[PDB]
Amino acid sequence: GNFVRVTDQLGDDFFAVDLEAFLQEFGLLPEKEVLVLTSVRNSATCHSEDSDLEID
Amino acid sequence: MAAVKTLNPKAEVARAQAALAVNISAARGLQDVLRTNLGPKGTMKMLVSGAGDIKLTKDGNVLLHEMQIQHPTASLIAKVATAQDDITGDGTTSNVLIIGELLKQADLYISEGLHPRIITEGFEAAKEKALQFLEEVKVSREMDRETLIDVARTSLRTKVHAELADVLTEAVVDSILAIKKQDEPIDLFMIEIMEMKHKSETDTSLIRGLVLDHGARHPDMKKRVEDAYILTCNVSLEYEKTEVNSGFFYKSAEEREKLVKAERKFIEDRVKKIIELKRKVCGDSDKGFVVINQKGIDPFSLDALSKEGIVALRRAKRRNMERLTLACGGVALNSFDDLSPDCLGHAGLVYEYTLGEEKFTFIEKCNNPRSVTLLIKGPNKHTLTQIKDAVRDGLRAVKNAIDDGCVVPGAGAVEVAMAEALIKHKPSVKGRAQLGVQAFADALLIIPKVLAQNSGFDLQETLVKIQAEHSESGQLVGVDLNTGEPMVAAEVGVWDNYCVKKQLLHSCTVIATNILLVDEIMRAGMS
């Protein structure tokens, strides 16, 4: 992306909608992915011996 | 210094008296600018954008949008005026004036050590009493043509020049009366506003039909049809590709020719259906057939329709489907599977008008059109924009006067009477809220003051004359902008929308109360 003097094609009162559309129409902005707005946190990642195992 | 600036060093903060002074200064600046807009004797403003486009206007909302202002209080007042314009369509200048005068009158007492909360309580009590008085003073009437003419004149004379206002008054009143159905809400989407740039500003008028900003795209199409069958459709008459990546495969030139000829049969079937219907309804040549399509028509179908003497229009507006259905009287079709003569609208005259490169189509002489169009004409773009804004204001005024069964006398008479009632009611209010009631009455008195000032007369002498005349007889007397003497607005014909006054009171009181209670302004989102 080689955007210079973005005010020429956006103005001085451009909002986030204008910049989002302007970036989308050149296909540089990654597509929007739906995600949970807010939730509780878990903060765990695999590791070792993280396995309940049946008694035997 | 302040607590906020310690956590965020580069934070802009105004506390208590500083914040209140900032808000009141911004409101007073807005009021000072918009004072000259009020009344038919107001001065035209000239607005030049960054690109250099010229806009001449007197509208309060337009001026608020086009001033180069970056103040927060100005932003709030602009939002309030925008809501006023969106709902009622009038009273934005009065909105700004009343807000500014309320803030000034409140500051008159707050600077004497009085707490703003008492002023806000007085404002609430005065607003309640004022609403009661306004309900008492409204003039319920049967909205005949004359009353609507008076209301439309009272709006347009303020908006535009007197002769242009006289023309636009009849235009808007007739347009509203044409589309109005008994005991039904008025849909203003059914009055098309079309701009043409060739004649004088007084040549604007009302067409009991529709005007389309596009014409027939085939040279052999007829330029004028006397008796027209209108077919409003939303079916694509141009070539369409298969959704599932069809592609063609052939082994010879003859096979390629056969595939080329056979790939257009789908659209040709619908064109054949249209042609068959046209031949059925009008076997002779006098009657005409007009096709208005929301979708596109490829040149092959255009030629096929032209060879049968059918004028066709493509890529029409989406709202034009409903507008043509209500005006001509047909049925908008999304498919041609079962099309019968009962789905065809009728127009008593369809002709094409060309203005430079731009192309127009007129549909007139309908039986009883429930959707009409207003043709704005003028020599300049800014003239067209100003006339369009004036027409919007007038249409809103007439629609409000019809929806409401009543109408309020104008010329500031209602403001003077309401202020007198508030002054009389003031002793009934217990505590120090009487100061807020007095401030509210004085703020309400701004409209006759500004009207007299714009007309050139002395503000105080005219105001005291109006008040003395009102108190002596009890009549609803307003300011005469020609002589400065008291005048009965109801008798003369100066009318104001009841809903506009009610919205003014409610919004102005709410925003003034909220601004007065603000004691701390922050901008601490950086770093």
Partner: protein, 528 residues
């Protein structure tokens, strides 16, 4: 270039000792002082300027704190505390910040001496347990079936907000919304104000015209003018799948060799659309709502059965409509059943407000979702009104879940402080001083109320303490509008026990968390 030998990075800053503790405590005190004046029935509003250009005019603590960007991590912790209080109970956001600041101040008093922070923390935890016990002791029950008392509770919750002028209307709206959105299924009760009970604000009009709708209102119009815009007793069908011909998942290139195959393919596209529409029509509905697009041919075939169609509706709005009209969203039209048809909506009407079309489904019998239609002066006024209504609904839900009630106006603070002070007389240890100090730190709420009212803080607070030393004066607080002592069982200001418990717990744990830090390291790379 030049190479200086280093253990940590150049941009790594480390500070420790009494300076860190003092800095944390003063940061918390400054955060409290920012919103100190926004508490009580006589609070003053503040203008917040967004970095995005917006304006926030509010006296709610959470909005003010969330609009402020800070560098000190203690202030960040305080703002997180404010957000936690807002999310948990929805009220008491301003009180918890002030309480945390006062507790940290009285802790700093001891940390200036030679008392270890762990002793202060243990005393604070003992005090918190005693506050919980006292609050549960002085609480009173409420009758949820009594509408008048619930309205009074909501009013006392909203008397401190800008919407207090229209108190009765706001209370009725909040109570009706919470009551009708209340749901019970599979033995699991729920309220779910977040998903349902949507608040829609349309600027303009008067706020006295605001009401809670007996159904759902959306900003939509019919797909085509021939649709009926007014249906008496509609049967509503909700869908997610598009009513238009779409590509398949797999690569499905065709190969046309015969002449008629192209027209045949187009005809089968039309036939597939017609088959979908006929499958929909088989249930004989009146309204069809889709989360995705509806083709023009589909609109025509639906018109042939005289069915109104609305497309491109948000998933949340469609779920709200399903709850309101008692319908079930169906993906495949061929799998529609009779019980999936929404019967129970007593009116559907598309009317024009301003210059926009709005769709109303507002006559449902026993609706489980609602739209709170807010009309007012402008956008910021309506945003503040929505925030106040959210506070009212949160308080109503808290009372419905927990029917315990606690006196307000600082009466509970003084009662708990007196009980803890009396209890501290029989410990005879070194922890009695921090215990008593954090007990008396609860008096910052009545003091703040008196200061905001403009009365004499010292005389009124001394009189209130003397009154609370008596034998039955647990309900004696301060009148925040007149600056006089009054019994709260006469004034009528009562608050849910859940809100008070959450406020005290959060304040004490914030003080405990900020009292455990003596070292600050900053500037290191995130490393990830």
């Amino acid at each position: 270039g030049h190479r200086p030998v280093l253990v940590l990075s150049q941009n790594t800053k480390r500070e420790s000792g009494r300076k860190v503790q003092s800095g944390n405590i003063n940061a918390a005190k400054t955060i409290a002082d920012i919103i100190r004046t926004c508490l009580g029935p006589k609070s003053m509003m503040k203008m917040l300027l967004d970095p995005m250009g917006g304006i926030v005019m509010t006296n709610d603590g959470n909005a003010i704190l969330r609009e402020i960007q800070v560098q000190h991590p203690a202030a960040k912790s305080m703002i997180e505390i404010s957000r936690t209080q807002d999310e948990e109970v929805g009220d008491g956001t301003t009180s918890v910040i002030i309480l945390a600041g006062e507790m940290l101040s009285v802790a700093e008093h001891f940390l200036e001496q030679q008392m270890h922070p762990t002793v202060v923390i243990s005393a604070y935890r003992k005090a918190l347990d005693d506050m919980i016990s006292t609050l549960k002791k002085i609480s009173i029950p409420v009758d949820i079936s009594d509408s008048d008392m619930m309205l009074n509770i909501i009013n006392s919750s909203i008397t401190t907000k800008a919407i207090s002028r229209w108190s009765s209307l706001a209370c009725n709206i909040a109570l009706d919304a919470v009551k009708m959105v209340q749901f019970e299924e599979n033995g699991r009760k729920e309220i779910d104000i977040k998903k349902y009970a949507r608040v829609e604000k349309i600027p303009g009009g008067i706020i006295e015209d605001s009401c809670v709708l007996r159904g759902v209102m959306i900003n939509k119009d019919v797909t085509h003018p021939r649709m009926r815009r007014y249906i008496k007793n509609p049967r509503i069908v909700l869908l997610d799948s598009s009513l238009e011909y779409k590509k398949g998942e797999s690569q499905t290139d065709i190969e046309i060799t015969r002449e008629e195959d192209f027209t045949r393919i187009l005809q089968m596209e039309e036939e597939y659309i017609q088959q979908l529409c006929e499958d929909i029509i088989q249930l004989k509905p009146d309204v069809v709502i889709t989360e995705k697009g509806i083709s023009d041919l589909a609109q025509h075939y639906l018109m042939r059965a005289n069915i109104t169609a609305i497309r491109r509706v948000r998933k949340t709005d469609n779920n709200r409509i399903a709850r309101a009209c008692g319908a079930r969203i169906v993906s495949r039209p061929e799998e529609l059943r009779e019980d999936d048809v929404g019967t129970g909506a007593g009116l559907l009407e598309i009317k024009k407000i301003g210059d926009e079309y709005f769709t109303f489904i507002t006559d449902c019998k026993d609706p489980k979702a609602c739209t709170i239609l807010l009309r007012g002066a402008s956008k910021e006024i309506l945003s503040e009104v929505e925030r106040n209504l959210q506070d009212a609904m949160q308080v109503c839900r808290n009372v419905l879940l927990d029917p315990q009630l606690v006196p307000g106006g600082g009466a509970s603070e003084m009662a708990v402080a007196h009980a803890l002070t009396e209890k501290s007389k029989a410990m005879t240890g070194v922890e009695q001083w921090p215990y008593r100090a954090v007990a008396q730190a609860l008096e910052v709420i009545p003091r703040t109320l008196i200061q905001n009212c403009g009365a004499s803080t010292i005389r009124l607070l001394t009189s209130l303490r003397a009154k609370h030393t008596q034998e039955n004066c647990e309900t004696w607080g301060v009148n925040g509008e007149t600056g006089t002592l009054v019994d709260m069982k006469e004034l009528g200001i009562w608050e849910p026990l859940a809100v008070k418990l959450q406020t005290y717990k959060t304040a004490v744990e914030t003080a405990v968390l900020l009292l455990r830090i003596d070292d600050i390291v900053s500037g290191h790379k995130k490393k990830g």
